[PDB]
């Protein structure tokens, strides 16, 4: 049985988001990719250079926003500047949210030698698509 990127069905009470509710064979059919760049095109290069940065960004943001992250990041790469879209639960005060976003928008830019934009959408709770 296929088990990659597949959340198993419990007795009928587990809340699952839209991204988790779809198997990997539904990519580009019902759900889109979590990241967009040019390294995965036909006549383009520098794919692993962007891939390692994507993985580092995923882990760094997961550690930076502990427990308040709703879904996975959306990493857009558009003309030397990278945008990070995140869905965050409204657990932290806005004073602490702004401190973290200001710290990140400078640390990531100085670490990757490229401008970084960070956008957060505050949700009251995790949005459930399928049974809960």
């Amino acid at each position: 049985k296929n088990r990659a990127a597949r959340v198993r069905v419990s007795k009928g009470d587990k809340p699952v988001t839209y991204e988790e509710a779809h198997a990997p064979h539904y990519i580009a059919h019902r759900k889109g990719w979590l990241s967009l760049h040019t390294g995965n095109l036909d006549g383009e290069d520098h794919a692993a250079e962007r891939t390692v940065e994507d993985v580092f960004l995923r882990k760094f943001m997961l550690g930076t926003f502990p427990g308040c992250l709703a879904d996975q990041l959306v990493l857009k790469r558009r003309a030397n500047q990278l945008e990070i879209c995140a869905l965050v639960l409204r657990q932290l005060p806005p004073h602490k949210f702004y401190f973290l976003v200001g710290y990140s928008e400078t640390l990531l830019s100085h670490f990757y030698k490229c401008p970084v934009h960070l956008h957060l959408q505050t949700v009251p709770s995790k949005v459930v698509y399928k049974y809960i």
Binding site: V55, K59, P66, G67, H95, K96, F99
Partner: protein, 85 residues
């Protein structure tokens, strides 16, 4: 070695082995205990090992009407905080 780390949910799922194959029919129940501890229960975000006080997380943003800079706790004060933790 940073990329070799995983999520705490996956770590606990593999450590407790709740979905083990031997526990399905009933071969388990020998060590009849399964406790999962949340590491982020009393973890304040701003606090760290070095005891740095950041104006946005640990200490308030404004004191005495003036802006606060980055501070560091004294060695004994940090030890007292660690003893409380």
């Amino acid at each position: 070695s940073f990329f070799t780390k995983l999520t705490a949910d996956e770590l606990w799922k593999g450590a407790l082995a709740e979905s083990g194959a031997g526990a399905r029919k009933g071969r388990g129940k020998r060590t009849k205990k399964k406790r999962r501890k949340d590491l982020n229960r009393g973890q304040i975000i701003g606090e760290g090992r070095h005891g740095f006080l950041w104006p946005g997380l640990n200490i308030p943003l404004m004191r005495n009407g003036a802006v606060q800079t980055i501070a560091q706790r004294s060695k004994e004060d940090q030890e007292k905080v660690e003893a409380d933790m």
